[PDB]
Design a binder for this molecule. Structure first.
Ligand SMILES: Nc1ncnc2c1ncn2[C@@H]1O[C@H](COP(=O)(O)OP(=O)(O)OP(=O)(O)O)[C@@H](O)[C@H]1O
Ligand SMILES: *C(=O)CCCC[C@@H]1SC[C@@H]2NC(=O)N[C@@H]21
Ligand SMILES: [Mg+2]
Lengths: 230, 673, 222
């Protein structure tokens, strides 16, 4: 909805399609599974393929805050399908993680989809590069997919990574901690060792993601990339 | 077992354990539908599983499950049970239950309320017995109220004195006094515990018989006025005034004395107008003079053993009597039909105070039902849990035969072939009792355990031949395990070259001695050389079965391998007792000779908790110097209470147990210096 | 030791109350041959149990949860301890047997600061890449992503079984029926028949072969 998009923009965040457009080359995104519904089309994930500086890549983005209620089965099916295509052709996978508007209670055995995604990440490990960019809050088993990828980046002040929420921490261990201290980008980049880099905002993060992707090869079969030298 | 005969269609069993299962089996044999009650803990017990329908009758504790009477009446109303069988204990002697059942149409299988009212206490029961022309213990009738009266009664009834707390029972509120000062102090103290435990506040002074034999007469009565006595029983072997070994045909009594016993018991029962099954107990001196002592108005715990010498079913006869039908057996019909011996297997440690109850879960439980002439009355199964709420009883093992020797041999074989893993039992104590020389001879008394074992049970004092056999079996089993460890499947890439060692030289440490063993293997035969002695051990060498039968020099021996470690420590149950042995190779023994004893602090000065249960109170506080013989705390569990003494002098550094807390087995109660 | 031996003592070992705990080592001893179990790291990270045993004479590796310690919750130490053992067993063609009773992961600021995510991913990876035959039995609980951690059906788990007292749910679905109807467990077996089922499954799975994409080596989240 337009109101949800405006609310997302008010927080200094972009939509999933805007992030995909910024990340990929202009006029190179090809989307897949457009008409897969859960009743809305898209199922809170945008999956497809594109080119960065003329090199093929497969991407998926999440817009739970502005679209969808929680992880259904088709979300995991779309992610698994795009990962299978990437492993078939031999191209890297880039995943923009944003599980803001995802209801933990509204999970109809989404752990099965989580397990399928984990299995595909493990299978693709060492075969194709995998990059994860956490652009929003994340909780539950969804935090394990970025951990299994090769590289993990976060956005400052707008990204989180934690097993259980601060309320559960207060209920169990009886300690007052906020979300920023528990799973903020600074915590995971300075004292936790989970994330690799933190960026000021979404645009800067995507620019650095393109620059970093220029370094990596497309597959383990290919040799290290060689560019023009001066 | 005639199903054409009309009896109750639905029967309720208001009990638990072995007795519930036994009653259910009898009712199934009689074609009666059965319903059983249980607590929340016993939701999967044997009796609830084997009996059609089941109702929860309350939480875990007995006071709110098997004594929460309103729950029982609601269950009966829901299931429309015509009759209830109380078994023994709990509500077997509650007159309020009798009147409550009489209020409704439900008939109570047992003695009428008048009989239990008469046999509710001791003194007026003795009065009515004496009015029935029955020999009784000499003494002074009436209520003792002052120490002066007690000591005077001591003067005119003889120097040995005994103080009894009336009513109650179960081996509590009982003391022997050997002096007038002892008489008065025991009187006041026993009044104190009577106030604390029973609340009757009324005592009895009696003459104490020296070296008595406890003889039971099983009697049956009906509403038609027919009274019968089923032989006798002998239950002298007991500790804490609680029976452990029971013997149906008394070896001490002859025919005419037994007939006198039966006639007197029948007369006493007719005096009470007894109309059910019961047992009357008697004390017999060395001069074959019998004196009355109590009668239980319920089915006895050792009821099955007399069945093995009579052939009739007590529960079936009780049900038929309750229905209204008269007895179909007369005085002349009952005869002795062989020999029978029963042992009560408890979940207690026999090495401490002739029995030390413990809790746990049964990892393995196997019964010797395939052995000839063996009957097991048990209410547990593999996976059963022993709580801190009920009887520590495990089962009853009954062996019947033609005579004494065959029955005792069968009892020993059954005890050897009984598998209990998960708790500590008293099988070793029972086997030592049944193989004792005095027990076989027949000269026993009520204090057999006290005088035969003065300092407490220690185990089996195995002889030289038995020691050699045990060492040979242990060495052979160790070598068998070593040989089995070398059997691998074919690899086809790196073939296994099996070693061809001929003789195994082993060092076996047992108790405190070290023996040298030379073992040789030939097929399934082990030739064992122990300090010059030569033995041959043959068996199937099945290393997975809990029981292992081995033929050592022709003698058949059943052993169990309770534990086994790669370091060589092995626990072997052999002839009832479990022995810990350490078997190593000779080179390993020489190398271990240089190993240090380590800094293991074997300085004692620490008292632990052999009682799992609830500690009632603590008599020490942090900063107290304990003394020898001074009890630290009393722990209640298993329907009894007992206190443990330090046995040494030492200041208490800290106290970890407080009054009303729960302390498990082996936990540190109080640390002393 | 016959491979068809029954274990009736396991029928009532799991307490009905979810709060009450039990000992998994008892179940492991009951299931395995001759009740022999060589435990690894028995005094470190006691909320997980790993070791070597034998079934029908074949060496097997066993991983399970311990509800006695920390209610069976998974933490950093348990994750690493289980992960390395699973990796070693997989590397040398040793079948794996898993007993699952886990409420989730231990919460707190210390666990988050220590990198619980990385070690959880370690355990997921170790269970996921295993190509040896693996048999999983759920005893009481499997909550949240912790169920996915210990060899879920979707990690190429060969055979999965659930006891009648098992329960699988997303959050704190009180019955194993959702997993059964969704195909997450092959059968709901009686506790006393675990040994025979496991032995038959190992016998039929001894010849398992799978093919994976070529690589020099993968990138485990060490
Ligand atoms: N008058 C007595 N003289 C000697 N010993 C006695 C006497 N009365 C009891 N005893 C001893 O105490 C034991 C138990 O006695 P008794 O049956 O009176 O106790 P109880 O606790 O009332 O028993 P129960 O459990 O049958 O109700 C006897 O087996 C015997 O060893
Ligand atoms: C609680 O566990 C009581 C067990 C049954 C009663 C025990 S056993 C038989 C004895 N007779 C009696 O009245 N109490 C004793
Ligand atoms: Mg008595």
């Amino acid at each position: 909805g337009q109101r949800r998009i405006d609310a997302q923009h008010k927080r200094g965040k972009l939509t999933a399609r805007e992030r995909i457009s910024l990340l990929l080359d202009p006029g190179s995104f090809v989307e897949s599974d457009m008409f897969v519904e859960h009743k809305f089309p898209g199922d809170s994930v945008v999956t497809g393929r594109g080119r960065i500086n003329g090199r093929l890549v497969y991407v998926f983005s999440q817009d739970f805050t502005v679209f969808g209620g929680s992880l259904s089965g088709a979300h995991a099916q779309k992610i698994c399908k795009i990962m299978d295509q990437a492993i078939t052709v031999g191209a890297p996978v880039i995943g923009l993680n944003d599980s803001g508007g995802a209801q933990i209670q509204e999970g109809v055995e989404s752990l099965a989809g989580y397990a399928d995604i984990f299995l595909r990440n493990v299978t693709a490990s060492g075969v194709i590069p995998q990059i994860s960019l956490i652009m929003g809050p994340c909780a539950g088993g969804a935090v394990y997919s970025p951990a299994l990828t090769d590289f993990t980046f976060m956005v400052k002040d707008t990204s989180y990574l934690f097993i259980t929420g601060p309320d559960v921490v207060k209920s169990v261990t009886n300690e007052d901690v906020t979300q920023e201290e528990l799973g903020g980008a600074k915590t995971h980049t300075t004292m936790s060792g989970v994330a690799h880099r933190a960026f000021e905002n979404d645009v800067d993060a995507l620019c650095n993601l393109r620059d970093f992707f220029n370094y990596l090869p497309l597959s383990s079969q290919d040799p290290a990339p060689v560019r023009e030298c001066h | 077992y005639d199903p054409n005969e009309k009896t109750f269609d639905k029967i309720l069993v208001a009990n638990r354990g072995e007795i519930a299962c036994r009653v259910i089996r009898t009712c199934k044999k009689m074609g009666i539908k059965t319903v059983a009650i249980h607590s929340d803990v016993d939701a999967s017990s044997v009796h609830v599983k084997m009996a059609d329908e089941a109702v929860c009758v309350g939480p875990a504790p007995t006071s709110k499950s098997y004594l929460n009477m309103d729950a029982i009446m609601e269950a009966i109303k829901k299931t429309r049970a015509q009759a209830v069988h109380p078994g023994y204990g709990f509500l077997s002697e509650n007159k309020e239950f009798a009147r409550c059942l009489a209020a409704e149409d439900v008939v109570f299988i047992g003695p009428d309320t008048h009989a239990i009212q008469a046999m509710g206490d001791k003194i007026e029961s003795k009065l009515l017995a004496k009015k029935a022309e029955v020999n009784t213990i000499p003494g002074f009738d009436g209520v003792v109220k002052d120490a002066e009266e007690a000591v005077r009664i001591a003067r005119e009834i003889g120097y040995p004195v005994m103080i009894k707390a009336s009513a109650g029972g179960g081996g509590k509120g009982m003391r022997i006094a050997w002096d007038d000062e002892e008489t008065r102090d025991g009187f006041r103290l026993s009044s104190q515990e009577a106030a604390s435990s029973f609340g009757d506040d009324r005592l009895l002074i009696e003459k104490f018989i020296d070296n008595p034999r406890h003889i039971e007469i099983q009697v049956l009565g009906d509403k038609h006025g027919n009274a019968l006595w089923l032989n006798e029983r002998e239950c002298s072997i007991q500790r804490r005034n609680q029976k452990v070994v029971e013997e149906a045909p008394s070896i001490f009594l002859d025919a005419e004395t037994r007939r006198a016993m039966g006639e007197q018991a029948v007369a006493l029962a007719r005096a009470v107008k007894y109309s059910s099954a019961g047992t009357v107990e008697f004390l017999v001196d060395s001069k074959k003079n019998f004196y009355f002592l109590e009668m239980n108005t319920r089915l006895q715990v050792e009821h099955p053993v007399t069945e093995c010498i009579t052939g009739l079913d007590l529960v079936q006869e009780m049900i038929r009597v309750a229905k209204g039908y008269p007895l179909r057996h007369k005085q002349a019909d009952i005869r002795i039909n062989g020999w029978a011996v029963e042992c009560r297997v408890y979940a207690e440690d026999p090495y401490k105070s002739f029995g030390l109850p413990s809790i746990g879960r049964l990892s393995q439980y196997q019964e010797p039902l395939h052995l000839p002439g063996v009957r097991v009355d048990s209410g547990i199964q593999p996976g059963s849990d022993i709580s801190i709420y009920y009887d520590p009883m495990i089962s009853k093992l009954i062996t019947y035969g033609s005579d004494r020797t065959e029955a005792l041999k069968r009892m020993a074989d059954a005890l050897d072939n009984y598998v209990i893993r998960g708790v500590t039992h008293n099988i070793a104590l029972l086997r030592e009792v049944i193989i004792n020389s005095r027990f076989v001879k027949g000269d026993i008394s009520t204090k057999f355990l006290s005088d035969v074992y003065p300092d407490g049970f220690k185990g089996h004092m195995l002889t030289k031949s038995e020691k050699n056999q045990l060492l040979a079996i242990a060495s052979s089993l160790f070598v068998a395990f070593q040989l089995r460890a070398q059997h691998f499947q074919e690899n086809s890439r790196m073939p296994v070259i099996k070693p061809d060692i001929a003789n195994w030289e082993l060092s076996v440490k047992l108790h405190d001695k070290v023996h040298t063993v030379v073992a040789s293997n030939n097929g399934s035969v082990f030739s064992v050389e122990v300090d010059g002695s030569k033995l041959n051990v043959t068996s199937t060498w099945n290393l997975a079965s809990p029981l292992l039968s081995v033929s050592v020099d022709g003698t058949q021996r059943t052993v169990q391998c309770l534990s086994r470690e790669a370091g060589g420590n092995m626990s072997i149950q052999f002839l009832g007792t479990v022995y810990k042995v350490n078997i190593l190779t000779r080179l390993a023994a020489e190398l271990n000779k240089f190993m240090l004893e380590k800094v293991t602090e074997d300085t004692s000065s620490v008292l632990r908790s052999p009682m799992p249960g609830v500690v009632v109170a603590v008599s020490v506080k942090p900063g107290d110097a304990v003394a020898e013989g001074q009890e630290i705390c009393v722990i209640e569990a298993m329907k009894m209470q007992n206190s443990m003494t330090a046995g040494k002098t030492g200041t208490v550094k800290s106290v970890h147990c407080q009054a009303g807390d729960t302390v498990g087995e082996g936990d540190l109660l109080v640390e002393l210096e | 030791d016959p491979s068809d031996r029954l274990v009736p003592e396991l029928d009532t070992i799991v307490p009905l109350e979810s709060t009450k705990a039990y000992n998994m080592v008892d179940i492991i001893h009951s299931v395995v041959d001759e009740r022999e179990f060589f435990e690894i790291m028995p005094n470190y990270a006691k909320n997980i149990i790993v070791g070597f045993a034998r079934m029908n004479g074949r060496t097997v590796g066993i991983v399970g949860n311990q509800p006695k310690v920390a209610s069976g919750c998974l933490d950093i130490n348990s994750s690493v301890k289980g992960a390395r053992f699973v990796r070693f067993c997989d590397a040398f063609n040793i079948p794996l047997i898993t007993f699952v009773d886990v409420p989730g992961f231990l919460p707190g600021t210390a666990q988050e600061y220590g990198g619980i995510i990385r070690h959880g991913a370690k355990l997921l990876y170790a269970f996921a890449e295993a190509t040896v035959p693996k048999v999983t039995v759920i005893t009481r609980k499997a909550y949240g992503g912790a169920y996915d951690v210990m060899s879920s059906k979707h990690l190429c788990g060969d055979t999965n079984y659930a006891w009648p007292t098992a329960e699988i749910a997303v959050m704190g679905f009180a019955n194993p029926f959702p997993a059964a109807v969704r195909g997450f467990v092959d059968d709901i077996i009686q506790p006393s028949s675990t040994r025979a089922r496991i032995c038959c499954d190992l016998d039929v799975l001894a010849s398992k072969k799978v093919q994976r994409p070529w690589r020099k080596h993968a990138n485990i989240p060490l």
